[PDB]
Design a protein around this ligand. Sequence first.
Ligand SMILES: CC(=O)N[C@H]1[C@H](O[C@H]2C[C@@H](C(=O)NCCS(=O)(=O)O)[NH2+][C@@H]2CO)O[C@H](CO)[C@@H](OS(=O)(=O)O)[C@@H]1O
Length: 506
Amino acid sequence: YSIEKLKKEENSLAKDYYIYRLLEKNKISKKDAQDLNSHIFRYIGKIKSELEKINPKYAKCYTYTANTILDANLTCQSVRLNSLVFIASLNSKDRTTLAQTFKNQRPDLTNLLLAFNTSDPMSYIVQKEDINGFFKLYNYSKKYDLDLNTSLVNKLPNHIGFKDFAQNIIIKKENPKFRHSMLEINPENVSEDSAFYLGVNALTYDKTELAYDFFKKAAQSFKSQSNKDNAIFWMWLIKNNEEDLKTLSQSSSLNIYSLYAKELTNTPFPKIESLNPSKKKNNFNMQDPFAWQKINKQIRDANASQLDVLAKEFDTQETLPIYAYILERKNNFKKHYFIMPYYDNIKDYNKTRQALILAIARQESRFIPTAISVSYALGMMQFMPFLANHIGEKELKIPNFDQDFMFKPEIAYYFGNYHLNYLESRLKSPLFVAYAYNGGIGFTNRMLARNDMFKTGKFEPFLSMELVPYQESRIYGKKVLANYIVYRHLLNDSIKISDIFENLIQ
Ligand SMILES: CC(=O)N[C@H]1[C@H](O[C@H]2C[C@@H](C(=O)NCCS(=O)(=O)O)[NH2+][C@@H]2CO)O[C@H](CO)[C@@H](OS(=O)(=O)O)[C@@H]1O
C-alpha cells in the first residue's frame, strides 16, 4: 500500500508494520514523513530509527559542557547532573564544588558527585546506604560487584528497581557478591516476583529452608493463580508436604505445575471446552490485518450483550480464532479453550507434531491469522520477517513469495512445521524447541552447553527452568509446554508429564 492510503487507517501495530515496510525500501519522501509521527502507534525501535533518518525550558543548559558547567545557573546545573555519564566526565574539583552547592537541596545528587571522585563509586554509595544511588550506579554499569551487609540488602527491596535487578543477576548468573549477599534478605521484606527470585537464588546456594520461606511468601502474595501455583510447587519440592501438592492439584489455573500435580495425585484432567461451529465461513476477511485490529478493539469494549452479538457474528469455522477469543472474554477467562482451527492443513502430520504446532500457535497468536507483534513477527505462527523470507525465498523458492504469505494459515502451519522440524532435529525436547522458537537456537545451544543447566541435580530439571537466562523465553517455554500436554491429551496421544521432565536431563 502507498503511504497516503495507509494514513487513512487507524493507528495500530498493523499500520506501523506497513509504515515500516515503506521506510525499509526508502519509499517515503520528506514531505510525506513530516506528519508521520502522529500516524505511528508504537514509536519505539526499528521504526523510530528508520524515521529519524528524515524541551526549550532546558535547551540552554545543554550548551554547557564538562569544562563550563560552573558558569551555568543553578537550574541548568541541576538539569545536566541528572546524567551519570555527565557526572563521570567532570573532574573532582568541579564535582566537589557542586556537591557543596547541592548538599541541602539534592542530597542524593551530592552523594553521587562525591562517589565519582573515588576509584569505586559503588563502594562509596554502599557505605552511605544510598539506595537510590545504588540502582542508578547499577544501571550505569553492571560491572560493580561487592559484598553487601544485612542492613543494606534489606533496604534494597523498597525500591521499584529491585525486582529486575534481582531477576537479572540471578537468571544471568552475574554479580556473585551481590547474589550471595541477598541470602540475608528477610522474607518479611519481599513479596511476589522479588520473593520468588530470592527463593530461586537461595536454592542455587542450597539454602532450602530459606528458599522455602521465600517461595511461601511469594505464594501468599502473588495475584495470579499461575504464579501462585509455581511458588507452591517449589514449596512442595522442598518439604514434600501433602497439603501443598493437594492445593496445587485443585488449581483452576491450567499450567505445567497444576497439570503435574494432577498426574501425581490421580486427579482427573481439567475440562477443556469444545468449539465446532456449524457454519464454514462468512464475509469477514481473516487475511485483512486492519480488520483484525478494528474488531479486537470492538471486542475489548463490549459488554455481555455486545459479546453475545459478536459471538453469533463470528460463529464460523473460518472465524474460529475470533469466536474463541470472544468466548474467552464472555466467560471471564475461567474456561479452557484449546481450539484446532484450519485443521485440514495439519491432519496428516503425526499427532505429536500436531500437538507441538498447535501448542506454539496457541501461545504465539491465539490462532489469529493476521497477528502482529511489537517486533513485527507475523501471522498465526509469529515468524520474524527475516526467517519467513529465508524459508520462503532461499530454502523453498516459492514463486512470488512475500512475507505477508505468513498471514495465510496454510503457509503459517507449513513454515511452522518446517522450522519446528529443524529445531527438533537438533534439540529433541518440546521445551527446548519452544525456547529456540522464541529466543533462537543460538541462545538455546549456549544454555544447554553449560555444565550447570539441565544436568542431573536434586531439584532438576525444575531449577534449570527457572534459570533460563532470557525472561521472555523462560516464561514462553512453560506456557508452550502446558499447551503441548493439553493438545496431546485432546488428540488421544497423552504422555506422562513425568516422562517429559525426565527427558530434560542430559
Ligand atoms: C519463528 C521466529 O521467527 N522466531 C524468531 C524469534 O521470533 C519471536 C519473537 C517473538 C516476539 O515477537 N516477541 C514480542 C511478543 S509481544 O508483541 O510483546 O506480545 N515471537 C516470535 C516467535 O516466538 O525471534 C528470535 C530473536 O530474534 C529469533 O532468534 S534468532 O534466530 O537467533 O534471531 C527467532 O528465530
